[PDB]
């Protein structure tokens, strides 16, 4: 409730970045391995696949409901699909490809709508979806995440790709460790400190890096909690 | 006696019919509180929404995963898929709508594939999805459950509502508590007692039976456990 739960997510696509169709998955099976045996704190896994047109037999967009464990959430996909969520008090799951700016404009309607329906959402915690990529070398990390995406937008019809693939990244989480930690736990802030994270560590090719950037942070939260009043 | 597990699923479609627009969603939310608020045996939830053509520009059908907490699953969408799932020796989620005859011919296919990749399968809990209807007057349910499906049916293209949707209902759980129970138990045996349940109590409108069937199960199972010791 000040205590930040952590989850993991994966996109669902064919041959992300460069990785050969079989490889993308073995990596993702490893990402899950850690979860089970080499960590704790990663307590839920998600599967971003939202780039899809979800409409019934009447060209009617379905209600993006995200399920995490017993809990149920709804993707803050728009101003209408977000307003509505206020109505029933449901928490939102912030998109990954949302320039932090614009995605901030949406927890805004969600404070404004909550108001409207005179709803009391002080205990509703949003979920933030970030694409981590940690490499002591500033720049390798960014040119690596610009491959997980550049593929991803082959599918989605992107106008951005005229002037924006850098911002998404700039919005996402990358660089050395400390600047990664100090960036998110900075961003939490711009979200009135009301979010939990679903962070994709799949741009990261060097498995050993990834396994190390995972159990590090585990051993970090597991402590931060322990250390001072959590569980 | 290995400790069997239970989740809860929800179907996802609009203007159900019989249940007006925000009728369903308002019941849905009531299921949800049952879980959070008065139960302890419902570990996860799910929002089935199968009837889609998870295609893309390239027309490649997307890997139909399903996630239940920190664990990954592969929906028995077909015979290949199951086979593919056989490799990674990932569990399967048998779906509420395939006729028990196909939620079996399919399980059969898995095990063929699996012990044909050397992937040990012993300890692999699969997951059964069934709609439920409970009320002493074991004839009611079938009507209010026949309804739901009859209210959904249209899209999917079921090899039967041009005959009747009596197989599907036959496959799911209609009748009366005391009975129903004994019957799914009877269904677990058809899969070497290594299948877990995902129960969607959303056929039954009277929300009092709902909260009762539910809390009825709960206690009854957490009692069982506290007994033969497993919690
Ligand atoms: C490595 C690749 C990318 C990783 C990205 C995600 C990593 C997880 C983030 C770790 C959190 C970290 C703690 C850790 O290092 O152990 C961490 C860091 C590094 C920093 C700089 C600040 C953190 C913080 N963690 C928390 C936290 O867990 N809970 C919290 O309430 N505040 C935290 N804060 C500050 C909050 O803003 C503030 O303390 C809180 O709102 C108190 O409220 P008020 O001011 O209103 O009284
Ligand atoms: C936990 C499981 C939940 C239960 C599942 C059974 C079905 C529940 C249905 C809940 C309906 C509810 C409607 C309510 O009561 O008013 C409801 C909810 C709770 C939410 C979050 C969204 C709804 C929605 N209902 C509708 C709807 O009825 N019709 C519609 O066209 N869009 C609806 N949407 C929104 C779509 O996002 C939108 O159509 C699409 O994004 C197009 O807009 P744009 O692109 O511009 O964003
Ligand atoms: C009311 C709405 C509909 C509800 C439908 C979903 C829930 C249905 C109830 C099923 C759970 C129930 C739990 C309970 O007892 O409280 C339940 C029922 C009703 C019945 C009839 C049998 C149960 C059973 N539950 C378990 C169980 O949790 N674990 C177990 O190992 N065996 C259980 N069994 C027996 C196994 O089949 C048995 O272990 C095996 O056949 C023998 O193994 P071996 O070959 O090694 O010797
Ligand atoms: C947990 C994170 C997600 C993983 C990352 C996303 C990338 C792919 C992950 C799994 C890889 C794998 C490929 C492999 O190992 O060779 C893989 C898996 C595990 C699964 C379950 C399905 C795959 C699949 N790979 C491919 C593929 O490369 N190409 C393709 O055309 N279809 C692929 N499919 C689709 C099926 O083969 C089939 O076309 C369809 O599902 C049949 O459904 P229906 O007939 O019922 O509609």
Coordinates of C-alpha atoms and ligand atoms in Angstrom, one line a residue:
Chain A
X1 CA 0.0 0.0 0.0
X2 CA 3.3 1.9 0.1
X3 CA 4.7 -1.6 -0.4
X4 CA 5.3 -2.2 -4.1
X5 CA 4.5 -5.6 -5.5
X6 CA 6.4 -6.6 -8.7
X7 CA 5.3 -8.8 -11.6
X8 CA 6.8 -9.7 -15.1
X9 CA 5.3 -9.5 -18.6
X10 CA 6.1 -10.7 -22.1
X11 CA 4.8 -9.4 -25.4
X12 CA 3.5 -12.2 -27.7
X13 CA 5.0 -11.9 -31.1
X14 CA 6.9 -13.7 -33.8
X15 CA 10.6 -13.2 -34.0
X16 CA 11.1 -10.2 -31.7
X17 CA 14.3 -8.2 -32.3
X18 CA 16.5 -10.6 -34.2
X19 CA 16.2 -13.8 -32.2
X20 CA 15.2 -16.8 -34.3
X21 CA 11.6 -18.0 -33.6
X22 CA 12.6 -20.8 -31.4
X23 CA 15.2 -18.7 -29.5
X24 CA 12.8 -15.9 -28.5
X25 CA 10.9 -18.5 -26.6
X26 CA 13.8 -20.4 -24.9
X27 CA 14.8 -17.0 -23.5
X28 CA 11.3 -16.4 -22.4
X29 CA 11.2 -19.8 -20.7
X30 CA 14.4 -18.8 -18.8
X31 CA 12.8 -15.5 -17.8
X32 CA 10.1 -17.8 -16.2
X33 CA 12.7 -20.1 -14.7
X34 CA 14.2 -17.3 -12.6
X35 CA 10.7 -16.4 -11.6
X36 CA 10.0 -19.9 -10.2
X37 CA 13.4 -20.8 -8.7
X38 CA 15.8 -17.8 -8.8
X39 CA 13.6 -15.1 -7.3
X40 CA 10.6 -14.3 -5.1
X41 CA 9.1 -10.9 -5.7
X42 CA 8.1 -11.6 -9.3
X43 CA 4.6 -12.8 -8.3
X44 CA 2.6 -12.5 -11.6
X45 CA 3.4 -12.8 -15.4
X46 CA 1.4 -11.0 -18.1
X47 CA 1.3 -11.3 -21.9
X48 CA 1.0 -7.9 -23.8
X49 CA -0.7 -8.7 -27.2
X50 CA -2.9 -5.6 -27.2
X51 CA -1.9 -4.6 -30.7
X52 CA -4.9 -6.7 -31.8
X53 CA -8.4 -5.7 -32.9
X54 CA -10.7 -7.1 -30.4
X55 CA -14.3 -6.6 -31.8
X56 CA -17.2 -9.0 -31.8
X57 CA -19.6 -9.7 -34.7
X58 CA -20.8 -6.1 -34.5
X59 CA -17.6 -4.2 -34.9
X60 CA -17.7 -3.5 -31.1
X61 CA -14.4 -3.2 -29.2
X62 CA -14.2 -5.5 -26.2
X63 CA -13.3 -4.3 -22.7
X64 CA -9.6 -4.7 -22.3
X65 CA -9.6 -6.5 -19.0
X66 CA -6.2 -7.6 -17.6
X67 CA -6.2 -10.3 -15.0
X68 CA -3.4 -10.6 -12.4
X69 CA -3.9 -13.4 -9.9
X70 CA -7.3 -13.0 -8.2
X71 CA -7.4 -9.3 -9.1
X72 CA -8.9 -7.8 -12.3
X73 CA -7.7 -4.7 -14.2
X74 CA -8.4 -2.7 -17.3
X75 CA -5.9 -1.3 -19.8
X76 CA -6.0 2.5 -19.9
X77 CA -6.2 2.4 -23.7
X78 CA -8.1 5.7 -24.1
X79 CA -10.1 8.4 -22.4
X80 CA -13.3 6.5 -22.8
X81 CA -12.0 3.1 -21.9
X82 CA -10.5 4.8 -18.8
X83 CA -13.4 7.0 -17.8
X84 CA -15.6 3.9 -17.7
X85 CA -13.1 2.1 -15.5
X86 CA -13.6 4.9 -12.9
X87 CA -17.2 4.1 -12.8
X88 CA -16.6 0.6 -11.3
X89 CA -13.4 1.6 -9.5
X90 CA -11.1 -0.8 -11.5
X91 CA -7.4 -0.2 -11.5
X92 CA -5.7 0.5 -14.8
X93 CA -2.7 -1.2 -16.5
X94 CA -0.6 1.6 -18.2
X95 CA 0.6 0.9 -21.7
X96 CA 4.2 0.3 -22.5
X97 CA 4.2 2.3 -25.8
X98 CA 2.7 5.4 -24.2
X99 CA 5.0 8.4 -24.2
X100 CA 5.1 8.9 -20.4
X101 CA 3.5 12.3 -21.0
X102 CA 0.4 11.1 -22.7
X103 CA 0.1 8.0 -20.5
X104 CA 0.0 10.6 -17.6
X105 CA -2.9 12.4 -19.2
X106 CA -4.8 9.2 -18.7
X107 CA -4.4 8.6 -14.9
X108 CA -5.7 12.1 -15.0
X109 CA -9.1 11.4 -16.4
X110 CA -9.0 8.6 -14.0
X111 CA -8.9 11.0 -11.1
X112 CA -11.4 13.3 -12.7
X113 CA -13.8 10.5 -13.6
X114 CA -13.4 8.9 -10.1
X115 CA -14.5 12.3 -8.9
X116 CA -17.5 12.4 -11.2
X117 CA -19.1 9.1 -10.2
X118 CA -18.3 10.3 -6.7
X119 CA -16.2 7.1 -6.4
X120 CA -13.6 6.6 -3.7
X121 CA -10.4 5.3 -5.3
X122 CA -7.6 6.1 -2.9
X123 CA -6.7 2.4 -2.5
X124 CA -6.8 1.6 -6.2
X125 CA -3.2 1.0 -7.5
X126 CA -2.5 1.2 -11.2
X127 CA 0.0 -1.2 -12.9
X128 CA 2.9 0.2 -14.9
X129 CA 4.3 -1.8 -17.9
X130 CA 7.9 -1.1 -18.7
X131 CA 10.4 -2.7 -21.1
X132 CA 13.7 -2.9 -19.0
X133 CA 17.1 -3.4 -20.6
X134 CA 20.1 -2.9 -18.3
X135 CA 23.7 -2.5 -19.6
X136 CA 26.5 -0.7 -17.9
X137 CA 27.1 0.7 -21.3
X138 CA 24.5 3.5 -21.7
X139 CA 24.1 3.2 -25.4
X140 CA 24.3 -0.6 -26.2
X141 CA 21.1 -1.0 -24.1
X142 CA 19.2 1.6 -26.1
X143 CA 20.3 0.3 -29.4
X144 CA 19.2 -3.2 -28.2
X145 CA 15.7 -2.1 -27.1
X146 CA 15.3 -0.3 -30.4
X147 CA 15.3 -3.8 -32.0
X148 CA 12.6 -5.3 -29.7
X149 CA 10.3 -2.5 -30.8
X150 CA 11.4 -1.7 -34.4
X151 CA 10.1 -5.3 -35.1
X152 CA 7.0 -4.8 -32.9
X153 CA 6.0 -1.8 -35.0
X154 CA 6.2 -3.7 -38.3
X155 CA 2.8 -5.1 -37.3
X156 CA 1.1 -2.1 -35.7
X157 CA 0.6 0.8 -38.2
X158 CA 3.0 3.4 -36.8
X159 CA 2.9 7.1 -37.6
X160 CA 5.4 7.5 -34.8
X161 CA 8.0 6.1 -37.1
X162 CA 8.3 9.5 -38.8
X163 CA 9.5 11.0 -35.5
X164 CA 9.1 8.6 -32.4
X165 CA 10.7 5.3 -31.4
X166 CA 13.2 7.2 -29.3
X167 CA 10.6 8.6 -26.8
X168 CA 9.0 5.2 -26.2
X169 CA 12.5 4.0 -25.3
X170 CA 13.1 7.3 -23.4
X171 CA 9.9 6.5 -21.6
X172 CA 11.0 2.9 -21.0
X173 CA 13.7 1.7 -18.6
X174 CA 17.3 1.4 -19.7
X175 CA 21.0 2.0 -18.9
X176 CA 23.2 0.9 -16.0
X177 CA 21.7 -0.5 -12.8
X178 CA 21.6 2.5 -10.4
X179 CA 20.2 4.8 -13.2
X180 CA 17.5 2.2 -13.9
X181 CA 16.5 2.0 -10.2
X182 CA 16.7 5.8 -9.8
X183 CA 14.7 6.3 -13.0
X184 CA 11.6 4.2 -12.2
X185 CA 11.6 5.1 -8.5
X186 CA 11.4 8.6 -9.9
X187 CA 8.7 7.9 -12.4
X188 CA 6.6 6.1 -9.7
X189 CA 6.4 9.7 -8.5
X190 CA 5.0 11.3 -11.7
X191 CA 2.2 8.7 -11.0
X192 CA 1.5 10.1 -7.5
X193 CA 3.4 7.0 -6.5
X194 CA 0.3 4.9 -7.2
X195 CA 1.7 2.1 -9.5
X196 CA 3.0 -1.4 -9.4
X197 CA 5.2 -2.7 -12.2
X198 CA 5.0 -5.4 -14.9
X199 CA 8.5 -5.0 -16.4
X200 CA 9.6 -6.9 -19.6
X201 CA 13.3 -7.9 -19.4
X202 CA 13.1 -9.5 -22.9
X203 CA 15.0 -7.0 -24.9
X204 CA 18.0 -8.3 -23.1
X205 CA 19.8 -10.9 -25.2
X206 CA 22.7 -11.8 -22.8
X207 CA 20.7 -14.3 -20.7
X208 CA 23.3 -14.2 -17.9
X209 CA 22.9 -10.4 -17.8
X210 CA 19.2 -10.8 -17.4
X211 CA 19.4 -13.6 -14.8
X212 CA 21.7 -11.3 -12.9
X213 CA 19.7 -8.1 -13.2
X214 CA 16.7 -10.2 -12.0
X215 CA 18.0 -12.0 -8.8
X216 CA 19.8 -8.8 -7.9
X217 CA 16.7 -6.7 -7.5
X218 CA 14.9 -9.6 -5.9
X219 CA 17.6 -9.6 -3.2
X220 CA 17.0 -5.9 -3.2
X221 CA 13.2 -5.7 -2.6
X222 CA 13.2 -8.8 -0.4
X223 CA 15.5 -6.6 1.7
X224 CA 13.9 -3.1 1.4
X225 CA 10.7 -4.8 2.6
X226 CA 12.4 -6.9 5.4
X227 CA 14.7 -4.0 6.4
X228 CA 11.8 -1.5 6.9
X229 CA 8.2 -2.4 7.5
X230 CA 6.5 -4.3 4.7
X231 CA 6.2 -8.2 5.1
Chain B
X1 CA -4.3 -37.1 -1.8
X2 CA -2.7 -34.4 -3.9
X3 CA -4.3 -31.0 -3.3
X4 CA -6.5 -30.1 -6.3
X5 CA -6.7 -26.4 -7.2
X6 CA -9.5 -24.0 -8.2
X7 CA -9.7 -20.6 -10.0
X8 CA -12.7 -18.8 -11.6
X9 CA -13.0 -17.7 -15.2
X10 CA -15.4 -15.3 -17.0
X11 CA -16.4 -15.3 -20.7
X12 CA -16.2 -11.9 -22.5
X13 CA -18.8 -10.7 -25.0
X14 CA -21.3 -7.9 -25.2
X15 CA -25.1 -7.3 -25.2
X16 CA -25.3 -10.9 -23.8
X17 CA -29.1 -10.3 -24.1
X18 CA -31.0 -12.0 -21.3
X19 CA -28.5 -10.2 -19.0
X20 CA -28.8 -6.5 -20.0
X21 CA -25.6 -4.6 -20.6
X22 CA -24.4 -3.6 -17.1
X23 CA -26.2 -6.5 -15.5
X24 CA -23.5 -9.0 -16.2
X25 CA -20.7 -6.6 -15.3
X26 CA -22.4 -5.9 -12.0
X27 CA -22.7 -9.6 -11.2
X28 CA -19.1 -10.1 -12.4
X29 CA -18.0 -7.7 -9.8
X30 CA -20.0 -9.7 -7.2
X31 CA -18.2 -12.9 -8.1
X32 CA -15.0 -11.0 -7.6
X33 CA -15.9 -9.8 -4.1
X34 CA -16.8 -13.3 -3.2
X35 CA -13.2 -14.3 -3.8
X36 CA -11.4 -11.3 -2.2
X37 CA -13.9 -10.9 0.5
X38 CA -15.3 -14.1 1.9
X39 CA -13.4 -17.1 0.3
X40 CA -9.8 -18.4 0.4
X41 CA -9.9 -21.3 -2.1
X42 CA -10.1 -19.2 -5.2
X43 CA -6.4 -18.6 -6.1
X44 CA -6.7 -17.2 -9.6
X45 CA -9.2 -15.8 -12.2
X46 CA -9.4 -15.8 -16.0
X47 CA -11.1 -14.0 -18.9
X48 CA -11.6 -16.4 -21.7
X49 CA -12.3 -14.7 -25.0
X50 CA -11.3 -17.4 -27.5
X51 CA -13.7 -16.7 -30.4
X52 CA -11.0 -14.3 -31.9
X53 CA -8.8 -14.6 -35.0
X54 CA -5.5 -13.6 -33.4
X55 CA -4.1 -13.1 -36.8
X56 CA -2.0 -10.3 -38.2
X57 CA -0.9 -8.6 -41.5
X58 CA 1.1 -11.8 -42.0
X59 CA -1.9 -13.9 -41.1
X60 CA 0.2 -16.0 -38.6
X61 CA -2.1 -17.2 -35.8
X62 CA -0.6 -16.1 -32.5
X63 CA 0.6 -18.5 -29.8
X64 CA -2.5 -19.0 -27.7
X65 CA -0.9 -18.8 -24.2
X66 CA -2.9 -18.4 -21.0
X67 CA -1.4 -17.2 -17.7
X68 CA -2.6 -18.1 -14.2
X69 CA -0.4 -16.2 -11.8
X70 CA 3.4 -16.8 -12.1
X71 CA 2.6 -19.9 -14.2
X72 CA 2.2 -20.2 -18.0
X73 CA -0.3 -22.4 -19.9
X74 CA -1.1 -23.3 -23.5
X75 CA -4.9 -23.5 -24.5
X76 CA -5.8 -26.7 -26.3
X77 CA -7.0 -24.5 -29.2
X78 CA -6.1 -27.4 -31.5
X79 CA -4.1 -30.6 -32.2
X80 CA -0.8 -28.8 -33.3
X81 CA -0.8 -26.3 -30.5
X82 CA -1.2 -29.0 -28.0
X83 CA 1.6 -30.8 -29.7
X84 CA 3.8 -27.7 -29.7
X85 CA 3.0 -27.4 -26.0
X86 CA 4.2 -30.9 -25.6
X87 CA 7.8 -29.8 -26.2
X88 CA 8.4 -27.2 -23.5
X89 CA 6.3 -29.6 -21.4
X90 CA 4.0 -26.7 -20.5
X91 CA 0.5 -27.4 -19.1
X92 CA -2.7 -27.1 -21.1
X93 CA -6.0 -25.4 -20.3
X94 CA -8.9 -27.5 -21.5
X95 CA -11.7 -25.2 -22.5
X96 CA -15.3 -25.1 -21.2
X97 CA -16.7 -25.3 -24.8
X98 CA -15.0 -28.3 -26.4
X99 CA -17.1 -31.5 -26.0
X100 CA -15.6 -33.7 -23.3
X101 CA -14.9 -36.0 -26.2
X102 CA -12.4 -33.5 -27.6
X103 CA -11.1 -32.4 -24.2
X104 CA -9.9 -36.0 -24.1
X105 CA -8.9 -36.9 -27.6
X106 CA -6.6 -33.9 -27.2
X107 CA -5.1 -34.8 -23.8
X108 CA -4.4 -38.1 -25.5
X109 CA -2.4 -36.3 -28.2
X110 CA -0.4 -34.3 -25.7
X111 CA 1.1 -37.4 -23.9
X112 CA 1.9 -38.9 -27.3
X113 CA 3.9 -35.9 -28.3
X114 CA 5.4 -35.3 -24.9
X115 CA 6.9 -38.9 -24.5
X116 CA 8.4 -38.3 -28.0
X117 CA 10.6 -35.4 -27.0
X118 CA 11.7 -37.1 -23.8
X119 CA 10.0 -34.4 -21.7
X120 CA 8.9 -36.0 -18.4
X121 CA 5.2 -35.3 -17.8
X122 CA 4.4 -36.9 -14.4
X123 CA 4.0 -33.8 -12.2
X124 CA 2.1 -31.6 -14.7
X125 CA -1.2 -30.2 -13.5
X126 CA -3.3 -29.3 -16.6
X127 CA -6.4 -27.1 -16.1
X128 CA -10.1 -27.8 -16.8
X129 CA -12.6 -25.0 -17.6
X130 CA -16.3 -25.6 -16.7
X131 CA -19.4 -23.5 -16.5
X132 CA -21.5 -24.3 -13.4
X133 CA -25.2 -24.2 -12.5
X134 CA -26.4 -25.2 -9.0
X135 CA -29.9 -25.6 -7.6
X136 CA -31.6 -28.6 -6.0
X137 CA -34.1 -28.5 -8.9
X138 CA -31.5 -29.9 -11.2
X139 CA -33.7 -29.1 -14.2
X140 CA -33.6 -25.3 -13.8
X141 CA -29.8 -24.9 -14.4
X142 CA -29.9 -26.6 -17.7
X143 CA -32.4 -23.9 -18.8
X144 CA -30.5 -20.9 -17.5
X145 CA -27.2 -22.4 -18.7
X146 CA -28.6 -23.4 -22.0
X147 CA -29.6 -19.8 -22.1
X148 CA -26.1 -18.3 -21.6
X149 CA -24.6 -20.4 -24.3
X150 CA -27.7 -20.0 -26.5
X151 CA -27.0 -16.4 -25.8
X152 CA -23.3 -16.8 -26.8
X153 CA -23.3 -19.7 -29.4
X154 CA -23.8 -17.7 -32.6
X155 CA -20.2 -16.7 -33.1
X156 CA -18.1 -19.8 -32.3
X157 CA -19.7 -22.1 -35.0
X158 CA -20.3 -25.1 -32.7
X159 CA -20.7 -28.5 -34.4
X160 CA -24.1 -28.9 -32.6
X161 CA -26.5 -25.9 -32.3
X162 CA -27.8 -27.1 -35.6
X163 CA -28.5 -30.3 -33.8
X164 CA -28.5 -29.0 -30.2
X165 CA -26.1 -27.6 -27.6
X166 CA -26.7 -30.6 -25.2
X167 CA -23.1 -32.0 -25.5
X168 CA -21.6 -28.7 -24.3
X169 CA -24.1 -28.5 -21.4
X170 CA -23.4 -32.2 -20.9
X171 CA -19.7 -31.4 -20.7
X172 CA -20.2 -28.6 -18.2
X173 CA -21.7 -28.6 -14.7
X174 CA -25.5 -28.3 -14.4
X175 CA -27.8 -30.0 -11.9
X176 CA -27.7 -29.7 -8.1
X177 CA -24.8 -29.0 -5.7
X178 CA -24.4 -32.4 -4.0
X179 CA -24.6 -33.9 -7.4
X180 CA -22.6 -31.4 -9.5
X181 CA -19.7 -31.9 -7.0
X182 CA -19.5 -35.7 -7.2
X183 CA -19.6 -35.3 -11.0
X184 CA -16.6 -33.0 -11.6
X185 CA -14.8 -35.3 -9.2
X186 CA -16.1 -37.9 -11.6
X187 CA -14.5 -35.9 -14.4
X188 CA -11.0 -35.6 -12.8
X189 CA -10.7 -39.3 -13.2
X190 CA -10.9 -39.1 -16.9
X191 CA -7.5 -37.3 -16.9
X192 CA -5.5 -39.6 -14.4
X193 CA -6.6 -37.3 -11.6
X194 CA -4.2 -34.6 -12.9
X195 CA -6.3 -31.7 -14.0
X196 CA -7.2 -28.5 -12.1
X197 CA -10.5 -26.6 -12.3
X198 CA -11.4 -23.2 -13.5
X199 CA -15.1 -22.9 -12.6
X200 CA -17.3 -20.1 -14.2
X201 CA -20.4 -19.7 -12.0
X202 CA -22.0 -17.2 -14.4
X203 CA -24.9 -19.1 -15.7
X204 CA -26.7 -18.8 -12.5
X205 CA -28.3 -15.3 -12.2
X206 CA -29.9 -15.5 -8.7
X207 CA -26.8 -13.9 -7.1
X208 CA -27.7 -15.6 -3.7
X209 CA -27.1 -19.1 -5.0
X210 CA -23.9 -17.7 -6.5
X211 CA -22.4 -16.5 -3.2
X212 CA -23.8 -19.7 -1.6
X213 CA -22.6 -22.3 -4.1
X214 CA -19.2 -20.5 -3.9
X215 CA -18.8 -20.1 -0.1
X216 CA -20.4 -23.5 0.0
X217 CA -17.5 -25.0 -2.1
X218 CA -14.8 -22.9 -0.4
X219 CA -15.4 -24.0 3.2
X220 CA -16.1 -27.5 2.1
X221 CA -12.7 -27.8 0.3
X222 CA -10.6 -25.8 2.8
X223 CA -12.2 -28.1 5.4
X224 CA -11.1 -31.2 3.4
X225 CA -7.6 -29.8 3.3
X226 CA -7.3 -28.7 6.9
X227 CA -8.3 -32.3 7.5
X228 CA -6.1 -34.6 5.4
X229 CA -3.4 -31.9 6.0
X230 CA -2.3 -29.9 3.0
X231 CA -2.6 -26.3 4.4
Ligands
LIG1 C1 17.0 -2.6 -12.8 C2 16.1 -2.4 -14.0 C3 14.9 -1.5 -13.8 C4 14.1 -1.8 -12.5 C5 12.9 -1.0 -12.2 C6 12.0 -1.2 -11.1 C7 12.8 -1.6 -9.8 C8 12.1 -1.5 -8.5 C9 12.2 -0.2 -7.7 C10 12.9 -0.4 -6.4 C11 12.5 0.6 -5.4 C12 13.5 1.3 -4.5 C13 13.7 0.6 -3.2 C14 14.8 -0.4 -3.2 O1 15.9 0.1 -3.8 O2 14.9 -1.3 -2.4 C15 13.4 2.8 -4.3 C16 14.3 3.7 -4.8 C17 15.6 3.3 -5.5 C18 14.1 5.1 -4.6 C19 15.0 6.2 -5.0 C20 12.9 5.5 -3.9 C21 11.9 4.6 -3.5 C22 12.2 3.2 -3.7 N1 11.3 2.4 -3.3 C23 10.1 2.7 -2.7 C24 9.2 1.7 -2.2 O3 9.3 0.5 -2.4 N2 8.1 2.2 -1.6 C25 7.8 3.6 -1.5 O4 6.8 3.8 -0.9 N3 8.7 4.5 -1.9 C26 9.8 4.1 -2.5 N4 10.7 5.0 -2.9 C27 10.4 6.5 -2.7 C28 8.9 6.8 -2.6 O5 8.8 7.9 -3.5 C29 8.5 7.2 -1.2 O6 9.4 6.7 -0.3 C30 7.1 6.8 -0.8 O7 6.1 7.3 -1.7 C31 6.8 7.3 0.6 O8 5.5 8.2 0.5 P1 5.3 9.6 1.1 O9 6.4 10.4 0.6 O10 4.1 10.2 0.5 O11 5.3 9.4 2.6
LIG2 C1 -13.9 -9.4 -14.8 C2 -14.7 -9.8 -16.0 C3 -15.7 -8.7 -16.5 C4 -17.0 -9.2 -17.0 C5 -17.1 -9.7 -18.4 C6 -18.5 -9.7 -19.0 C7 -18.7 -8.4 -19.8 C8 -18.6 -7.1 -19.0 C9 -18.9 -5.9 -19.8 C10 -18.7 -4.6 -19.1 C11 -19.3 -3.4 -19.9 C12 -18.8 -2.1 -19.5 C13 -19.8 -1.0 -20.1 C14 -20.5 -0.1 -19.1 O1 -21.2 -0.6 -18.2 O2 -20.8 1.0 -19.5 C15 -17.5 -1.6 -20.1 C16 -16.4 -1.5 -19.3 C17 -16.3 -1.9 -17.8 C18 -15.2 -1.1 -19.9 C19 -13.9 -0.9 -19.2 C20 -15.2 -0.7 -21.3 C21 -16.3 -0.8 -22.0 C22 -17.5 -1.3 -21.4 N1 -18.6 -1.4 -22.2 C23 -18.6 -1.1 -23.5 C24 -19.8 -1.3 -24.2 O3 -20.8 -1.7 -23.7 N2 -19.9 -0.9 -25.5 C25 -18.6 -0.4 -26.1 O4 -18.9 -0.2 -27.3 N3 -17.5 -0.3 -25.4 C26 -17.4 -0.6 -24.2 N4 -16.4 -0.5 -23.4 C27 -15.2 0.1 -24.0 C28 -14.2 -0.3 -25.1 O5 -12.9 0.0 -24.6 C29 -14.5 0.7 -26.3 O6 -15.7 0.4 -26.9 C30 -13.3 0.7 -27.3 O7 -12.1 1.1 -26.6 C31 -13.7 1.7 -28.5 O8 -13.3 3.1 -27.9 P1 -12.0 3.9 -28.1 O9 -11.2 3.2 -29.1 O10 -12.2 5.2 -28.5 O11 -11.3 3.7 -26.6
LIG3 C1 -20.9 -26.6 -6.5 C2 -20.4 -26.1 -7.8 C3 -19.6 -27.1 -8.6 C4 -18.2 -27.4 -8.1 C5 -17.3 -28.2 -9.0 C6 -15.8 -28.1 -8.8 C7 -15.4 -28.8 -7.5 C8 -15.8 -30.2 -7.3 C9 -15.3 -30.9 -6.0 C10 -14.1 -31.6 -6.1 C11 -13.2 -31.6 -4.9 C12 -13.5 -32.5 -3.7 C13 -12.6 -32.0 -2.6 C14 -13.1 -32.6 -1.3 O1 -13.0 -33.7 -1.0 O2 -13.4 -31.7 -0.4 C15 -13.4 -34.0 -4.0 C16 -14.5 -34.7 -4.3 C17 -16.0 -34.2 -4.3 C18 -14.4 -36.1 -4.6 C19 -15.6 -37.0 -4.8 C20 -13.2 -36.7 -4.6 C21 -12.0 -36.0 -4.3 C22 -12.2 -34.6 -4.0 N1 -11.0 -33.9 -3.8 C23 -9.8 -34.4 -3.8 C24 -8.6 -33.6 -3.5 O3 -8.7 -32.4 -3.3 N2 -7.4 -34.3 -3.5 C25 -7.3 -35.7 -3.9 O4 -6.2 -36.0 -3.9 N3 -8.4 -36.4 -4.1 C26 -9.6 -35.9 -4.1 N4 -10.7 -36.5 -4.3 C27 -10.6 -38.0 -4.6 C28 -9.5 -38.3 -5.8 O5 -10.3 -38.7 -6.9 C29 -8.7 -39.5 -5.3 O6 -7.6 -38.9 -4.5 C30 -8.1 -40.4 -6.3 O7 -9.3 -40.9 -7.1 C31 -7.5 -41.7 -5.6 O8 -6.0 -41.6 -5.9 P1 -4.9 -42.8 -5.8 O9 -5.1 -43.4 -7.3 O10 -3.6 -42.2 -5.7 O11 -5.2 -43.6 -4.7
LIG4 C1 5.8 -16.3 -22.6 C2 6.3 -15.3 -23.6 C3 5.9 -15.5 -25.0 C4 6.8 -16.0 -26.0 C5 7.3 -15.2 -27.1 C6 6.5 -15.1 -28.4 C7 7.2 -15.9 -29.5 C8 6.7 -17.3 -29.7 C9 6.7 -18.2 -28.5 C10 6.5 -19.7 -28.7 C11 7.3 -20.3 -29.8 C12 6.7 -21.4 -30.6 C13 7.5 -21.8 -31.8 C14 8.2 -23.1 -31.9 O1 8.9 -23.3 -30.8 O2 8.6 -23.6 -33.0 C15 5.3 -21.5 -30.8 C16 4.4 -22.0 -29.7 C17 5.0 -22.4 -28.3 C18 3.0 -22.1 -29.9 C19 2.1 -22.6 -28.8 C20 2.5 -21.8 -31.1 C21 3.2 -21.4 -32.2 C22 4.7 -21.2 -32.0 N1 5.4 -20.8 -33.0 C23 4.9 -20.5 -34.2 C24 5.7 -20.0 -35.3 O3 6.9 -19.8 -35.3 N2 5.1 -19.7 -36.5 C25 3.7 -19.9 -36.7 O4 3.3 -19.6 -37.8 N3 3.0 -20.3 -35.7 C26 3.4 -20.6 -34.5 N4 2.8 -21.0 -33.4 C27 1.3 -21.2 -33.7 C28 0.8 -22.7 -33.8 O5 1.9 -23.4 -34.3 C29 -0.4 -22.7 -34.8 O6 -0.1 -22.0 -35.9 C30 -1.6 -22.2 -34.1 O7 -1.3 -21.9 -32.6 C31 -2.7 -23.4 -34.1 O8 -3.9 -22.8 -33.5 P1 -5.4 -22.9 -34.1 O9 -5.1 -23.9 -35.2 O10 -6.1 -23.5 -33.0 O11 -5.8 -21.6 -34.3

